[PDB]
């Protein structure tokens, strides 16, 4: 067990082992950001809860830093569940939306101002990433950067449909590490 | 009281010229729309220069007509100032002044308007205001882009650093104004008086800007001629003899490859290299 | 086939949701036998909640009741005096809305007595009501012809 | 009640949607289509819409029937398909085969607006060259399956078996509810409207004191419907490029 404070305003509390992370820890980023999960060797490895400056929590499985492998991500009527390849999303997902700016405008039909089902859907999708990238290092296109993440393509040509409606913040990372995120459902709305 | 006086574009002329062409609202809502500007320019409690007509824009729910006045901060993209309205002739209201992060951060996001300004916008990539602030970052989009004159109408005032329009400009045929060669950006780019023929070809050598004639028949001798926007659909310029005019009319979606936002990236950790426990010498 | 008495309240008809409810009455298959959107005065509005002359809250309902037009409505179903009541649901607004978010005062209520409805509640209150407002409606004049109390209506007649 | 649309009160009506006309398009229209409607035996011919092309000449589509009938649970429309590029002209748009279907569903963009093009597809390297006439007729076959839109109960089943106009139908109870429009292909009396649609993809305008309904298709931005209460009138049109709108969960 240890806690740890580092130059930059970073900290850590959780387990080390041989002078580096390992094990369960909270991570808490000069940002903002913490990150509660497992790690080793000094890095996030396994499954973790990423809380961003955002106020958005990321899960997924870490691997030698990057998430990798199926990921979800969730803000309050978004929810995004896919592949990422070294961190950046890359191939099948579905992304869910709910529609919160119209939760209190009229209905258009008279059979969902009763219904017990939200105006939720949901889209099979896919992201794409250049050819020679994506591999591991050990020439070639390089990955989607973040202002501008150029390459980065994305295809959707299937029709969306209905879905189970969302609620923020997902039950998989309460306790929250941060301050200000709201609260969204759909009979509360933003809040 | 006197009506104040403020100057405008021939309008009736514009619908004309827009039926003609096959865009527009019609002619009906071009006669609306004059009496409209006309009830705002002679207006005392608002003392406006010049009134014009930017376009109009669909929502879910209502709809925004939308005008561009003058008033006899000031610079750059906030010139001019916007005044919409859910019908002609009903209440308006002014639209509030852009910023920079407003509008860079909803060049990001894709959004059908709900017809409702007092509305939220967006949850994950975060827009800074209200319905209203989306409408004028999109109101701002479009005018750097598509707000177009006849080439050689206007010319770069020096020290006023404004336009001049002359007054020996001779239009080309109506067919001949169908050229992306023949009309010139208006609108600070967001030089000034560039050729339309110069803008960001769309993805295979394609032109951003589409003619559209007025008749089948290229011996017909009085026709009009126009262009018509690739990436912003609903935008069309378009002149028949000695009038000419450009409107909006449309969604307010840009066209172009659309990418969500991917979630942001995670923050790396303090380098081991430079935090690592030291020992004394061993026995 | 029984016949129920309803009530769409001023604070909902203020806020243009009438013929909201109305077509949400026709979707839960009812059948409005007759409508009608009127201003109930003060006295009538006492006759008909007479039997609460002494409740409290009498003065802060029907000032309420008074506020503006009512639609009053006549219902028709299989089993229909019961069925609107668990449309309209619970009576307290906030009771309702935590218990049946997507009951009918759950959505268009705010308060204990704007609550948007009025049900009947007893078949015999639902036939006084709308002798009441419709007195034209003719009903059931197959349970009133008994051969013995028509002498007695008789009598009642001279 | 009407027996068909006009293309006087379309063009009047949903002008304020941007659905318009060139002036010597709707003079030409209003003469060829009763020829066309004449000579080829129809008994309704009306405009159906207006696809945008990248050299101008954009491609006026009009569709025409002869009877309707009840087949497998859908009210089947023998419908036939006309394109022009002027308005006096009407050439026919030929059916397409289901395997081009596929292919020219796969081809993007506005349309070239020459006849004679012909777009290119790889597959497993075996390339396919589709016509544009063919992509044309899909996007429309695409928007016609999605939209077709009329009122509820405004038709009704004859004695044949045949989908004929309910000259009794007295008008939308509430036209501000998505429950009072249905498609065309679902049966009389079948309750399918357009509320069992996917949630969020048709938007809905009522102006209560005129009494014009407007519904515009969300999914197919471009598809413009217009319901007038008082006179009983009503008529749909297409003017766009064609393509679906596949961000629509991002966009509402």
């Known amino acids: 067990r240890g806690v740890m404070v580092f130059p930059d305003g970073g900290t850590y509390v959780g387990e080390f082992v041989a002078d580096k992370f390992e094990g369960q820890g909270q991570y808490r980023y000069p940002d903002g950001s913490v990150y509660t999960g497992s790690w080793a060797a000094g890095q996030k490895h396994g499954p973790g809860v990423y809380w961003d400056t955002a106020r958005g929590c990321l899960r997924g499985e870490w691997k030698k830093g990057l998430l990798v492998g199926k990921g979800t991500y969730e803000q309050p009527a978004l929810r995004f569940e896919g592949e990422f390849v070294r961190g950046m999303p890359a191939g099948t997902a579905t992304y869910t939306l709910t529609g919160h700016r119209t939760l209190d405008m009229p209905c258009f039909a008279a059979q969902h101002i009763q219904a017990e089902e939200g105006p939720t859907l949901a889209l099979p999708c896919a992201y794409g990433i250049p050819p020679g990238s994506g591999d591991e290092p050990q020439d070639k296109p390089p990955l989607p950067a973040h202002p501008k993440y150029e390459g980065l393509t994305f295809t959707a040509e299937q029709l969306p449909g209905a879905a189970p409606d969302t609620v923020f913040p997902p039950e998989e990372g309460k306790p929250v590490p941060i301050t200000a995120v709201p609260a969204f459902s759909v009979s509360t709305g933003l809040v | 009281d006197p009506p104040n006086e403020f100057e405008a574009e021939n309008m009736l002329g514009a619908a004309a010229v827009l039926d003609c062409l096959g865009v527009g609202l019609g002619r009906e809502l071009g006669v609306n729309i004059a009496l409209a500007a006309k009830r705002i320019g002679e207006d005392p409690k608002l003392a406006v220069r010049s009134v014009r007509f930017f376009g109009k824009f669909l929502g879910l729910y209502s709809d925004y007509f939308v005008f561009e006045v003058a008033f006899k901060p000031g610079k750059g993209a906030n010139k001019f100032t916007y005044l919409v309205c859910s019908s002609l002739g009903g209440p308006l209201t002014r639209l509030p002044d852009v910023t920079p992060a407003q509008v860079k951060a909803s060049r990001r996001i894709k959004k059908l308007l709900t017809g409702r300004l007092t509305s939220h916008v967006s949850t994950y990539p975060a827009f800074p205001g209200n319905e209203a602030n989306y409408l004028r970052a999109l109101i701002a989009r479009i005018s750097a882009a598509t707000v177009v004159a006849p080439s050689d109408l206007f ?44 803008d960001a070809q769309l993805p295979g050598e394609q032109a951003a800007w589409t003619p559209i004639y007025s008749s089948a028949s290229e011996a017909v001798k009085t026709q009009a001629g126009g262009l018509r926007s690739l990436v912003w659909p609903g935008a069309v310029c378009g002149g028949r003899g000695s009038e000419w005019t450009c409107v909006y009319v449309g969604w307010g979606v840009k066209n172009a490859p659309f990418v969500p936002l991917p979630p942001p990236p995670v923050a790396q950790e303090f380098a081991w290299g430079e935090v690592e426990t030291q020992e004394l010498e061993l026995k | 086939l029984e016949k129920t008495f309803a009530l769409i309240k001023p604070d909902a008809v203020r806020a243009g949701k009438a013929q909201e409810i109305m077509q949400l009455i026709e979707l839960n298959g009812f059948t409005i036998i007759a409508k009608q959107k009127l201003q109930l005065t003060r006295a009538r509005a006492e006759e008909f909640y007479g039997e609460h002359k002494g409740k409290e809250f009498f003065p802060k309902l029907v000032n309420f009741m008074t506020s503006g037009p009512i639609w009053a409505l006549v219902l028709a179903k299989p089993g229909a005096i019961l069925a609107w009541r668990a449309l309209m649901g619970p009576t307290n607004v906030f009771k309702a809305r935590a218990e049946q978010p997507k009951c009918l005062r759950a959505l268009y209520g705010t308060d204990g007595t704007q609550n948007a409805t009025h049900g009947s509640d007893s078949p015999i209150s639902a036939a006084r009501e709308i002798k009441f407002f419709f007195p034209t409606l003719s009903g059931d004049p197959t349970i009133y012809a008994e051969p013995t109390a028509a002498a007695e209506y008789i009598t009642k007649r001279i | 009640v009407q027996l068909e649309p006009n293309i006087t009160l379309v063009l009047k009506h949903l002008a304020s949607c941007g659905a318009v006309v060139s002036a010597e398009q709707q003079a030409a229209l209003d003469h060829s289509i009763p020829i066309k409607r004449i000579e080829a035996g129809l008994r309704s011919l009306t405009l159906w819409g207006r696809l945008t092309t990248l050299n101008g000449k954009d491609y006026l589509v009009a569709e025409g029937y002869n009877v309707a009938s009840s087949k497998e649970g859908a009210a089947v429309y023998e419908t036939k398909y006309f394109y022009s590029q002027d308005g006096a002209r009407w050439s026919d748009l030929q059916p397409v085969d289901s395997e081009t279907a596929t292919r020219c569903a796969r081809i993007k963009g506005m349309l070239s607006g020459d006849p004679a093009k012909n777009y290119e597809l790889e597959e497993k390297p075996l390339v396919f060259q589709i016509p544009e006439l063919a992509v044309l007729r899909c996007r429309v076959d695409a928007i016609a399956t999605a939209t077709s839109v009329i009122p509820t109960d405004s038709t009704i089943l004859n004695a044949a078996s045949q989908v004929v106009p309910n000259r009794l139908f007295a008008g939308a109870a509430y036209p501000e509810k998505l429950e009072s429009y249905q498609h065309r292909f679902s049966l009389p009396g079948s309750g399918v409207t357009l509320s069992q649609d996917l949630r969020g993809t048709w938007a809905v305008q009522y102006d209560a004191f005129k009494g014009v309904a407007q519904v515009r298709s969300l999914l197919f931005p471009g598809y413009f419907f217009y319901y007038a209460a008082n006179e009983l009138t009503w008529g749909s049109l297409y003017v766009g490029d064609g393509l679906r709108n596949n961000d629509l969960i991002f966009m509402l």
């Open chain 2, 155 to 198: 010319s770069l005032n020096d020290e006023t650093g404004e336009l001049e329009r002359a007054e020996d400009w001779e239009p080309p045929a109506g067919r001949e104004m169908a050229a992306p060669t023949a009309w010139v950006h208006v609108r600070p780019h967001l030089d000034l008086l560039a050729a339309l023929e110069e």
